Write an enzyme that holds these catalytic residues in place. Structure first.
Site, PDB file in Angstrom:
ATOM      1  CG  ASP A  47      25.362  72.470  34.800  1.00 19.57           C
ATOM      2  OD1 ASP A  47      26.438  72.598  34.231  1.00 19.57           O
ATOM      3  OD2 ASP A  47      24.862  71.343  35.033  1.00 19.57           O
ATOM      4  CE  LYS A  81      26.980  69.427  32.864  1.00 13.35           C
ATOM      5  NZ  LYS A  81      25.567  69.505  33.310  1.00 13.35           N
ATOM      6  CG  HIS A 114      27.282  64.767  30.825  1.00  8.69           C
ATOM      7  ND1 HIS A 114      25.938  64.932  30.576  1.00  8.69           N
ATOM      8  CD2 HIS A 114      27.435  64.858  32.171  1.00  8.69           C
ATOM      9  CE1 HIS A 114      25.298  65.044  31.721  1.00  8.69           C
ATOM     10  NE2 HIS A 114      26.187  65.029  32.703  1.00  8.69           N
ATOM     11  CB  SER A 214      26.338  66.125  44.319  1.00  7.81           C
ATOM     12  OG  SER A 214      25.638  65.465  43.275  1.00  7.81           O
ATOM     13  CB  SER A 218      23.395  63.831  45.503  1.00 11.90           C
ATOM     14  OG  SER A 218      22.852  62.837  46.387  1.00 11.90           O
ATOM     15  NE  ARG A 273      14.216  73.351  49.344  1.00 13.88           N
ATOM     16  CZ  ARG A 273      12.983  72.989  49.691  1.00 13.88           C
ATOM     17  NH1 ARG A 273      12.450  73.408  50.831  1.00 13.88           N
ATOM     18  NH2 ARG A 273      12.283  72.188  48.893  1.00 13.88           N
ATOM     19  CD  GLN A 276      18.099  78.787  52.310  1.00 18.61           C
ATOM     20  OE1 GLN A 276      18.917  77.857  52.393  1.00 18.61           O
ATOM     21  NE2 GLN A 276      16.848  78.680  52.722  1.00 18.61           N
TER      22      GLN A 276
HETATM   23  N1  LIG Z   1      28.273  66.724  35.293  1.00 15.94           N
HETATM   24  C1  LIG Z   1      27.570  65.775  35.969  1.00 15.94           C
HETATM   25  O1  LIG Z   1      27.720  64.588  35.742  1.00 15.94           O
HETATM   26  C2  LIG Z   1      26.647  66.162  36.956  1.00 15.94           C
HETATM   27  C3  LIG Z   1      26.253  65.250  37.987  1.00 15.94           C
HETATM   28  C4  LIG Z   1      25.324  65.595  38.961  1.00 15.94           C
HETATM   29  C5  LIG Z   1      24.782  66.881  38.922  1.00 15.94           C
HETATM   30  N2  LIG Z   1      25.181  67.800  37.893  1.00 15.94           N
HETATM   31  C6  LIG Z   1      24.636  69.192  37.834  1.00 15.94           C
HETATM   32  O2  LIG Z   1      24.763  69.710  39.189  1.00 15.94           O
HETATM   33  C7  LIG Z   1      23.443  70.102  39.685  1.00 15.94           C
HETATM   34  C8  LIG Z   1      23.422  70.014  41.197  1.00 15.94           C
HETATM   35  O3  LIG Z   1      23.679  68.653  41.623  1.00 15.94           O
HETATM   36  P1  LIG Z   1      22.518  67.692  42.128  1.00 15.94           P
HETATM   37  O4  LIG Z   1      21.108  67.976  41.664  1.00 15.94           O
HETATM   38  O5  LIG Z   1      23.017  66.465  42.734  1.00 15.94           O
HETATM   39  O6  LIG Z   1      21.956  68.260  43.623  1.00 15.94           O
HETATM   40  P2  LIG Z   1      22.612  69.332  44.684  1.00 15.94           P
HETATM   41  O7  LIG Z   1      22.533  70.784  44.354  1.00 15.94           O
HETATM   42  O8  LIG Z   1      23.458  68.738  45.767  1.00 15.94           O
HETATM   43  O9  LIG Z   1      21.153  69.483  45.522  1.00 15.94           O
HETATM   44  C9  LIG Z   1      20.456  68.432  46.071  1.00 15.94           C
HETATM   45  C10 LIG Z   1      19.164  68.810  46.851  1.00 15.94           C
HETATM   46  O10 LIG Z   1      19.257  70.007  47.592  1.00 15.94           O
HETATM   47  C11 LIG Z   1      17.926  70.561  47.737  1.00 15.94           C
HETATM   48  N3  LIG Z   1      18.204  71.990  48.128  1.00 15.94           N
HETATM   49  C12 LIG Z   1      18.530  73.015  47.329  1.00 15.94           C
HETATM   50  N4  LIG Z   1      18.706  74.114  48.062  1.00 15.94           N
HETATM   51  C13 LIG Z   1      18.478  73.794  49.369  1.00 15.94           C
HETATM   52  C14 LIG Z   1      18.490  74.551  50.526  1.00 15.94           C
HETATM   53  N5  LIG Z   1      18.815  75.859  50.425  1.00 15.94           N
HETATM   54  N6  LIG Z   1      18.201  73.986  51.746  1.00 15.94           N
HETATM   55  C15 LIG Z   1      17.878  72.607  51.772  1.00 15.94           C
HETATM   56  N7  LIG Z   1      17.850  71.843  50.572  1.00 15.94           N
HETATM   57  C16 LIG Z   1      18.159  72.464  49.396  1.00 15.94           C
HETATM   58  C17 LIG Z   1      17.209  70.306  46.395  1.00 15.94           C
HETATM   59  O11 LIG Z   1      15.769  70.130  46.625  1.00 15.94           O
HETATM   60  P3  LIG Z   1      14.628  71.233  46.095  1.00 15.94           P
HETATM   61  O12 LIG Z   1      14.692  71.168  44.593  1.00 15.94           O
HETATM   62  O13 LIG Z   1      13.321  70.859  46.595  1.00 15.94           O
HETATM   63  O14 LIG Z   1      15.121  72.489  46.692  1.00 15.94           O
HETATM   64  C18 LIG Z   1      17.990  69.061  45.870  1.00 15.94           C
HETATM   65  O15 LIG Z   1      17.192  67.908  45.892  1.00 15.94           O
HETATM   66  C19 LIG Z   1      22.423  69.226  38.883  1.00 15.94           C
HETATM   67  O16 LIG Z   1      21.067  69.736  38.787  1.00 15.94           O
HETATM   68  C20 LIG Z   1      23.142  69.288  37.471  1.00 15.94           C
HETATM   69  O17 LIG Z   1      22.946  70.571  36.775  1.00 15.94           O
HETATM   70  C21 LIG Z   1      26.087  67.416  36.927  1.00 15.94           C
HETATM   71  C1  LIG Z   2      25.247  61.586  33.553  1.00 19.53           C
HETATM   72  C2  LIG Z   2      24.023  61.445  34.455  1.00 19.53           C
HETATM   73  C3  LIG Z   2      23.919  61.932  35.695  1.00 19.53           C
HETATM   74  C4  LIG Z   2      24.807  63.003  36.297  1.00 19.53           C
HETATM   75  C5  LIG Z   2      24.217  64.439  36.013  1.00 19.53           C
HETATM   76  O1  LIG Z   2      23.210  64.827  36.690  1.00 19.53           O
HETATM   77  O2  LIG Z   2      24.820  65.149  35.165  1.00 19.53           O
HETATM   78  C6  LIG Z   2      22.785  61.518  36.279  1.00 19.53           C
HETATM   79  C7  LIG Z   2      22.366  61.577  37.590  1.00 19.53           C
HETATM   80  C8  LIG Z   2      21.345  60.745  38.030  1.00 19.53           C
HETATM   81  F1  LIG Z   2      20.910  60.822  39.245  1.00 19.53           F
HETATM   82  C9  LIG Z   2      20.757  59.873  37.141  1.00 19.53           C
HETATM   83  C10 LIG Z   2      21.234  59.791  35.821  1.00 19.53           C
HETATM   84  C11 LIG Z   2      22.235  60.606  35.409  1.00 19.53           C
HETATM   85  C12 LIG Z   2      22.996  60.635  34.253  1.00 19.53           C
HETATM   86  C13 LIG Z   2      22.717  60.176  33.009  1.00 19.53           C
HETATM   87  C14 LIG Z   2      21.602  59.367  32.794  1.00 19.53           C
HETATM   88  C15 LIG Z   2      21.723  57.983  32.909  1.00 19.53           C
HETATM   89  C16 LIG Z   2      20.605  57.162  32.711  1.00 19.53           C
HETATM   90  C17 LIG Z   2      19.362  57.735  32.390  1.00 19.53           C
HETATM   91  S1  LIG Z   2      17.963  56.705  32.125  1.00 19.53           S
HETATM   92  C18 LIG Z   2      18.267  54.944  32.255  1.00 19.53           C
HETATM   93  O3  LIG Z   2      17.445  57.050  30.713  1.00 19.53           O
HETATM   94  C19 LIG Z   2      19.239  59.124  32.267  1.00 19.53           C
HETATM   95  C20 LIG Z   2      20.351  59.943  32.472  1.00 19.53           C
END
Ligand SMILES: NC(=O)c1ccc[n+]([C@@H]2O[C@H](COP(=O)([O-])OP(=O)(O)OC[C@H]3O[C@@H](n4cnc5c(N)ncnc54)[C@H](OP(=O)(O)O)[C@@H]3O)[C@@H](O)[C@H]2O)c1
Ligand SMILES: CC1=C(CC(=O)O)c2cc(F)ccc2/C1=C\c1ccc([S@](C)=O)cc1
Length: 316
Positions: A47, A81, A114, A214, A218, A273, A276
């Site tokens: 993703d 996206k 997105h 998340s 998150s 991780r 895992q």
């Molecule tokens: N469509 C959208 O608007 C949108 C919004 C937010 C996110 N997303 C997508 O969804 C993905 C996941 O969401 P997100 O990054 O918020 O975080 P998420 O997967 O909830 O993970 C958050 C934290 O979990 C840690 N982690 C991972 N595996 C673990 C484990 N087995 N045990 C303990 N901690 C662990 C990671 O740290 P480490 O890296 O150190 O393991 C990370 O900082 C994003 O990367 C993105 O591709 C899309």
């Molecule tokens: C849509 C979006 C998300 C959700 C996702 O992970 O998909 C996101 C999550 C964050 F924690 C921070 C920023 C973003 C984001 C877009 C975005 C907004 C401002 C910036 S800066 C001010 O250039 C960069 C990116």
């Protein structure tokens, strides 16, 4: 072989995906290494997004693992996206094409709107005027969707869907005159503190797959996430289930989503991780266990993106 779900366009989506977004002070070099490791570990679904500014690195990882024989393209499900600076219909395809040029891939498996709030066109992903105000644009998302539909017809995106859509906005797509393709999914925040039962049920009723982001609570990166919010993986019920199953609270949270019929993403850049997380396929939770996790629900939304609040299409 690996576990997938049939989408409403007949394509298949692997039910565990690798998240690639990292905070901006993580060098982009780390995404290359992370995605290779994910593939090695058995993730078949990746993703990403234009706005993550990592497509060059994620594309290289993918190309690398194909060119070296570890995997075939058809066994990678890659998502990109469409960013809100390219919602105008004539800009949709060119944005997909730049993503594909940056990735050096011929197609994406999935392309998503997105975020429903549109901003002004141009190179800047968050365009602002001289006084720091976000430059919002007025765009009909039904026209955006027609342009997405054309990208599927051209083969550039195998499937199309949305992200961070609410009930009203989905209906606006579903009820669109001349609608050719439903969204295959709605990618949204979802975890045991925000379990989205209501929207999940709606999506099921329309055969739209809910993709959970998340799901581990998150990245908790400021200023996007309120550091006062509760730490999901520190929950005592998740940690007790973990202890009981000799797993981790993260695995428990991930298994919860698979059993309720959600496709789940998990980001990690940490080698241990990453390995895992694919263990989610090694154990199962009982109905009682599942009910206990349903009980954790508490209306906690970590990711408001409220820099886009104000316009009518802000979804929360
Ligand atoms: N469509 C959208 O608007 C949108 C919004 C937010 C996110 N997303 C997508 O969804 C993905 C996941 O969401 P997100 O990054 O918020 O975080 P998420 O997967 O909830 O993970 C958050 C934290 O979990 C840690 N982690 C991972 N595996 C673990 C484990 N087995 N045990 C303990 N901690 C662990 C990671 O740290 P480490 O890296 O150190 O393991 C990370 O900082 C994003 O990367 C993105 O591709 C899309
Ligand atoms: C849509 C979006 C998300 C959700 C996702 O992970 O998909 C996101 C999550 C964050 F924690 C921070 C920023 C973003 C984001 C877009 C975005 C907004 C401002 C910036 S800066 C001010 O250039 C960069 C990116």
């Amino acid at each position: 072989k690996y576990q997938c779900v049939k989408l409403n366009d007949g394509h298949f989506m692997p039910v565990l995906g690798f998240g690639t977004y990292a905070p901006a002070e993580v060098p982009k070099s780390k995404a290359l290494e992370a995605v290779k490791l994910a593939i090695e570990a058995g993730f078949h679904h990746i993703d990403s997004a234009h706005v993550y500014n990592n497509e060059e690195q994620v594309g290289l990882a993918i190309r690398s693992k194909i060119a070296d024989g570890s995997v075939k393209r058809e066994d990678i499900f890659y998502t990109s996206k469409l960013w809100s600076n390219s919602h105008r219909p004539e800009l949709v395809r060119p944005a997909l094409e730049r993503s594909l040029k940056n990735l050096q891939l011929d197609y994406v498996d999935l392309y998503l709107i997105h975020f429903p709030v549109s901003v002004k066109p141009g190179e800047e992903v968050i365009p602002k005027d001289e006084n720091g105000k976000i430059l919002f644009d007025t765009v009909d998302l039904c026209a955006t969707w027609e342009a997405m539909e054309k990208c599927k017809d051209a083969g550039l995106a195998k499937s199309i869907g949305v992200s961070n859509f609410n009930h009203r906005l989905l209906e606006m797509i579903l009820n669109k005159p001349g609608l050719k393709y439903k969204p295959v999914c709605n990618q949204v925040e979802c975890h045991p503190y925000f379990n989205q039962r209501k929207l999940l049920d709606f999506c099921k009723s329309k055969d739209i797959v809910l993709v959970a982001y998340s799901a581990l609570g998150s990245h908790r990166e400021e200023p996007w996430v309120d550091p006062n919010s509760p730490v999901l993986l520190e929950d005592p019920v998740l940690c007790a289930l973990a202890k009981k199953h000799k797993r981790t609270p993260a695995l428990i949270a991930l298994r919860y989503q698979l059993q309720r019929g959600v496709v789940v993403l998990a980001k990690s850049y940490n080698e241990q991780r990453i390995r895992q997380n694919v263990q989610v396929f090694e154990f199962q939770l009982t109905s009682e266990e599942m009910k206990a996790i349903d009980g954790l629900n508490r209306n906690v939304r970590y990711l408001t993106l409220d820099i886009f609040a104000g316009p009518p299409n802000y979804p929360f």
